Design a protein around this ligand. Sequence first.
Ligand SMILES: Nc1nc2c(ncn2[C@@H]2O[C@H](COP(=O)(O)O)[C@@H](O)[C@H]2O)c(=O)[nH]1
Ligand SMILES: Nc1nc2c(ncn2[C@@H]2O[C@H](COP(=O)(O)O)[C@@H](O)[C@H]2O)c(=O)[nH]1
Lengths: 170, 170
Amino acid sequence: YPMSARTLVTQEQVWAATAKCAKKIAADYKDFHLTADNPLYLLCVLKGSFIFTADLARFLADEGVPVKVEFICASMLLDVRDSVENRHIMLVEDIVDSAITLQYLMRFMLAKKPASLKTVVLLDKPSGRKVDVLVDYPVITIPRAFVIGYGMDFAESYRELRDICVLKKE
Amino acid sequence: YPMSARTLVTQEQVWAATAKCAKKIAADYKDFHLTADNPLYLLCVLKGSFIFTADLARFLADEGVPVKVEFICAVRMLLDVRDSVENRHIMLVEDIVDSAITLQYLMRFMLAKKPASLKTVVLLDKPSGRKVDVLVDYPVITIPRAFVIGYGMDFAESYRELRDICVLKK
Ligand SMILES: Nc1nc2c(ncn2[C@@H]2O[C@H](COP(=O)(O)O)[C@@H](O)[C@H]2O)c(=O)[nH]1
Ligand SMILES: Nc1nc2c(ncn2[C@@H]2O[C@H](COP(=O)(O)O)[C@@H](O)[C@H]2O)c(=O)[nH]1
């Protein structure tokens, strides 16, 4: 990958951590009795979370967790199509840094009165925090650095790369 | 994988056919000398094509085809995307084309914005359903008009998470 100073996490490693996190989710939701009529709603935060969402959805299928998928866009612009009142919802994020974005989305989904709200994030950068939020499922915790790949971009480019890379200094 | 479904195509087989299509796309666009600044734009038609887009994007990366990604949900989010495609190379990405009313509607809408080029890639083409005449440039798989679920496609919003493409019987 020519623009990458270094591979931070390979595709294989992202998949192995996401599979384990999917088994955790399943275990945490077992007492909720989820079915097709009362599923886990994955709320995909566009653009960057689209790859993680596609792959996490399939790992959750491996664990028998029934899902429905919604697409949201703030940086609102695209809201849920399905009512999520009385539903179990999960915000799906690629990367959280200051958490200002996530905090807004959380507050905003909460006032739709869902049964529960949880957050899953592929890459958490907790040393970046400017506000205080609950990240229920931070799959991988990493230091501050600007990353690209696996849905995350630099100036709209590089979302297609399979591995997560730290962008070359320029 | 619900009781009323049968496997049409497995995840592995979708992946092999898409890798091959990505190779053909890379050869087709070779003389356009695509770069990060002048890339192939994938216009993901939500919701059903989200997984196909996440996977195809990564097969395009394997081929060195630089991409950028946009999402269509078919006023304001459609308008936005349309307003930025002038003299860009765009590819509409669809799960299934049947009557082609949808695809035609989306093609005309994008063409009005005058892209440098427009092509369409379609995971499952159902040419026997056609009500209008459109060019489908990259039909990955061709099928009769069955009802399909899985691999990002739903019934009543369920089953998008399944890894394989299944058909539901009558
Ligand atoms: N591509 C990329 N995006 C980042 C990175 N760190 C933060 N983000 C994105 O930047 C935005 C701001 O994040 P926030 O400060 O609110 O947590 C979010 O859309 C987030 O996903 C990064 O390292 N790489
Ligand atoms: N889930 C699912 N959607 C279908 C199927 N057949 C057509 N569609 C829906 O209808 C759209 C295409 O319709 P058209 O306008 O071409 O007749 C597809 O993008 C898809 O959303 C199918 O077998 N399964």
